[PDB]
């Protein structure tokens, strides 16, 4: 910073030299070692952390069909609630690298037929899921699937 440019200029002059480690040795070694003293004497862990704090009211497990040990995964959900009636079990679709991507869900229109209650459930699904934000976790979709059953049961009752 002030009066150190001989030390700075010596190393740039002595750089790209093969005798560098020996030139510095020859010019420097006896000065410090004399006075100052002598020398001394399967599944990724993302889903494993995801399912850890999932609700016990879901019993989601893997799909028995489709491919396995690959990038894309599918989880079929089980709902055991005494409050809510029976519905189709629903199945998701999550590709590889589950963080920072937006997954999908299967489509089967005829499974929710023979009852306008199931059609209202499907319409509520198309209402709630279309405004869900990007890159969200599976808890948001699971809970929006869970609340719509009560939201349709109150209209049915």
């Amino acid at each position: 910073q002030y009066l150190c440019q001989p030390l700075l200029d010596a190393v740039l002059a002595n750089i790209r030299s093969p005798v560098f480690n020996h030139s510095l040795y020859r010019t420097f070694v006896p000065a410090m070692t004399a006075i100052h003293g002598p020398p001394i004497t399967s599944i990724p862990s993302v889903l494993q952390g995801e399912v850890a704090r999932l609700d016990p009211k879901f019993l989601v497990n893997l799909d028995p069909s489709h491919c396995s040990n690959n990038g894309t995964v599918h989880l079929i959900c089980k709902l055991d609630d005494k409050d809510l009636p029976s519905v189709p079990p629903l199945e998701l679709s999550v590709p590889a690298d589950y963080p920072a991507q937006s997954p999908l869900w299967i489509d089967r229109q005829w499974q929710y037929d023979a009852n306008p209650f199931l059609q209202s459930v499907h319409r509520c699904m198309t209402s709630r899921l279309l405004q869900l934000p990007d890159k969200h976790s599976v808890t948001a979709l699971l809970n929006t699937w869970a609340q719509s059953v009560h939201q349709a049961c109150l209209s049915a009752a």
């Binding site: 093969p18 005798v19 480690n21 020996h22 006896p30």
Partner: protein, 753 residues
């Protein structure tokens, strides 16, 4: 007596499976360089085509060569020297591997040859015509000319003088042969021709020279119904190409089939070879079935003019998977046979053999019976011996590097004197040549060291004063290496090993000077410098420096600053050695061997000329008197030591008056440093008979260059060539090249002494 050295094994490399296995072959250099391979089939094909080179002291830092090939290597051979290689395989694809820049782990091959649609059944090099005879009967001859004299085999096709040509020939699997010869220039001449009208399948063959540059070859179709034809090679280069004439020799049929009892036993031929290379009058022929094998020796002794005849066979054999030949050249005399039979001396009579079970057996070369028995507790694919055959390596169907140390003793009771004499002959076998002799230092006992070094002390004598001009370095290194194994002299080998560096640096700087005008003509200024040093034992030097022809020694005034460090070092090891008086010591032998001190007297008188001429190149030492020209009073001390050492065989302990004056040395001068060469990085201080060490690869169970005196850092960057013989860092790329000494670097441009 049989010893097992070690097994060096990679981790997660063995258990080759799910593949048709292949028999393997091995090769060895003139030097201690094993070239080997293994069949793996691990998600690539080149692992089967892989080349492994192992230097004989450090079995971990292996040199790897990915020899790319379309068909797997079948036969592997070296050159007669250690400069060329061959990796034989089907449909040509043969190269020429030359050594790269004198390293330990660098090869290249930019040339070679190839044949299309024709695998090769036999191949051999050309001939040199140089050979001597070994006489174990002449152990007390006391002359190298008697024990080692040339037999003078005829060199093959000597053109432009007595130099035999360089090249190789091969017999293909079909009715076709090829020849490729290297010119004295860079060009190569290759020819290929049908061997006869009959073109056919050839299961086995062999190639062997005859006296006069001609070659006799063998045939084996494998149909077990054809005669075993023999052909001759007539070398004739008709002004553009080597036109070769072929003719049929008197052939042979096969035995063990005309007895009519059982003839379709052993239904296919499995082995057909000559006993030894370069000679074609003795044929091994072995047929192996799925159970056993039967072996026959055929001899071309004249009674047809060329008729083959049976020799011998042992009791029983298994399926042979590996076979080799002994390599030590006994003079093939029956007196040598008898004097090697009464004493336990069999280094060149054992054909190597192996079976499909865990057993190691030799067979005697002349008489085909089982001479030795050992049990391994695998089918050996190949073995690979040494020239002395004191040690060998074996390749079974695993990655285990079984290295076995044999000996001619066998356990039949050899006395101590016969233990001296059996090893002394093979010591003289390697001291007469510029060879490598690591395998014969193995079986040395600690008590054997004192007995054998005393013999080697007189082995430097009894030669006619001209061999001893340059083999002094080799014998100094020889007793440097052999004294390492003894615990009493392992503290003394530093004296030998540093003296190798001292004699390496001594003579090479005594050639840079030259008289610009000649003084004392018809002789060098060096001898006059020697005589003025040995005639003036003066205490001081200022009286001396008048009559030293001061006007003769003139330098170029440029390399004196470059060569400072060496002249910094040679006067500093003296500075340590003056303080070793008041002390088996690693500097104790220099107190009685004043030849090094005589060279120290000789070197400094010309250095003082430059010290008074250009004092900027003077070696700066660490005295506590910076204005004191202490070199005169150190001339005083070295002359005081010299009058205790210039006597012819003095054996004189220097007096305590010198000791107290050397106790005045720490008042000014303190020991800077040392460099003990004998760092035992080799397996000399790691193994033991009946105590092998199962080695691995790459586990390896203040950094200053050993050659040049340039100090580096804690973990330096500059690369080195591996001086494998003693582990000194022969560093590769010298810092100064435009102003460099051209012999002190070039003397060990190849290897260390």
């Amino acid at each position: 007596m049989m010893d097992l050295a070690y097994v060096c094994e990679w981790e997660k490399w063995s258990k080759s499976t799910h593949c048709p296995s292949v028999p393997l072959a091995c090769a060895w250099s003139c030097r201690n360089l094993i070239a080997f391979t293994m069949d793996l089939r691990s998600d690539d094909q080149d692992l089967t085509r892989m080349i492994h080179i192992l230097d004989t002291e450090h079995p971990w830092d292996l040199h790897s060569i990915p020899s790319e090939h379309h068909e797997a290597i079948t036969c592997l051979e070296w050159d007669q020297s250690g400069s060329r290689l061959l990796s034989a395989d089907a449909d040509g694809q043969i190269k020429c591997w030359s050594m790269a820049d004198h390293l330990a782990n660098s090869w290249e091959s930019s040339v070679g040859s190839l044949v299309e649609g024709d695998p090769i059944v036999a191949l051999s090099w050309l001939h040199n015509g140089v050979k001597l005879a070994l006489h174990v009967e002449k152990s007390g001859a006391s002359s190298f000319g008697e024990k080692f004299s040339r037999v003078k085999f005829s060199p093959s096709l000597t053109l432009f003088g007595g130099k035999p040509m360089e090249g190789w020939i091969a017999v293909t699997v079909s009715g076709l042969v090829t020849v490729s010869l290297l010119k004295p220039s860079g060009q190569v001449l290759t020819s290929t021709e049908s061997l006869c009208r009959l073109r056919g399948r050839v299961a086995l063959a062999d190639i062997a020279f005859t006296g006069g540059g001609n070659i006799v070859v063998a045939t084996a179709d494998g149909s077990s119904a054809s005669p075993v034809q023999f052909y001759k090679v007539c070398v004739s280069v008709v002004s553009e190409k080597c036109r070769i004439d072929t003719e049929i020799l008197p052939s042979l049929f096969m035995r063990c089939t005309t007895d009519l009892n059982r003839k379709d036993k052993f239904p296919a031929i499995t082995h057909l070879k000559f006993l030894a290379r370069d000679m074609s009058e003795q044929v091994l022929l072995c047929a192996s079935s799925q159970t056993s094998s039967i072996v026959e020796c055929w001899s071309l002794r004249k009674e047809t003019i060329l008729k083959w005849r049976i020799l011998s066979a042992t009791n029983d054999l298994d399926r042979v998977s590996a076979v080799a030949l002994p390599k030590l050249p006994i003079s093939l005399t029956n007196t040598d046979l008898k004097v090697a039979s009464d004493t336990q001396f069999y280094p060149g009579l054992g054909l190597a053999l192996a079976f499909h079970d865990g057993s190691v057996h030799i067979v005697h070369r002349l008489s085909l019976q089982t001479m030795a028995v050992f049990y391994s507790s695998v089918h050996l694919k190949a073995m690979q011996l040494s020239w002395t055959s004191l040690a060998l390596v074996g390749i079974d169907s695993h990655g285990k590097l079984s290295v076995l140390r044999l000996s001619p003793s066998m356990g039949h009771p050899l006395e101590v004197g016969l233990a001296l004499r059996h090893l002394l002959f093979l010591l003289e076998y390697c001291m007469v040549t510029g060879y490598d002799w690591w395998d014969i230092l193995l079986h040395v006992q600690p008590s054997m060291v004192q007995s054998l070094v005393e013999k080697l002390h007189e082995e430097y004598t009894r030669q006619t004063a001209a061999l001893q001009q340059v083999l002094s370095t080799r014998i100094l290194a020889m007793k440097a290496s052999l004294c390492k194994l003894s615990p009493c002299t392992v503290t003394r080998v530093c004296d030998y090993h540093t003296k190798l560096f001292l004699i390496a640096i001594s003579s090479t700087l005594k050639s840079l000077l030259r008289p610009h005008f000649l003084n004392t003509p018809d002789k060098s200024p060096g001898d006059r410098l020697t005589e003025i040093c040995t005639k003036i034992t003066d205490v001081d030097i200022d009286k001396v420096m008048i009559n030293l022809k001061t006007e003769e020694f003139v330098l170029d005034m440029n390399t004196l600053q470059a060569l400072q460090q060496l002249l910094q070092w040679v006067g500093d090891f003296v500075l340590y050695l003056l303080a070793s008086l008041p002390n088996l010591r690693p500097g104790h032998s220099f107190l009685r061997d004043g030849t090094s001190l005589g060279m120290l007297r000789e070197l400094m008188v010309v250095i003082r000329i430059w010290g008074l001429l250009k004092p900027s190149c003077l070696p700066v030492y660490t005295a506590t008197s910076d204005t004191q020209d202490s070199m005169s009073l150190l001339f005083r001390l070295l002359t005081k030591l010299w009058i205790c050492c210039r006597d012819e065989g003095p054996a004189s302990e220097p007096d305590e008056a010198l000791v107290d004056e050397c106790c005045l040395l720490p008042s000014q001068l303190l020991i800077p440093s040392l460099d003990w060469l004998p760092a035992s990085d080799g397996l000399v201080s790691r193994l033991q008979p009946k105590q092998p060490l199962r080695l691995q690869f790459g586990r390896a169970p203040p950094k200053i260059d050993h050659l040049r005196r340039l100090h580096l850092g804690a973990c330096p960057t500059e690369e080195c060539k591996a001086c494998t013989r003693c582990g000194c860092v022969t560093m590769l790329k010298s810092p100064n090249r435009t102003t460099a000494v051209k012999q002190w670097e070039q003397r060990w441009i190849k290897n260390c002494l």
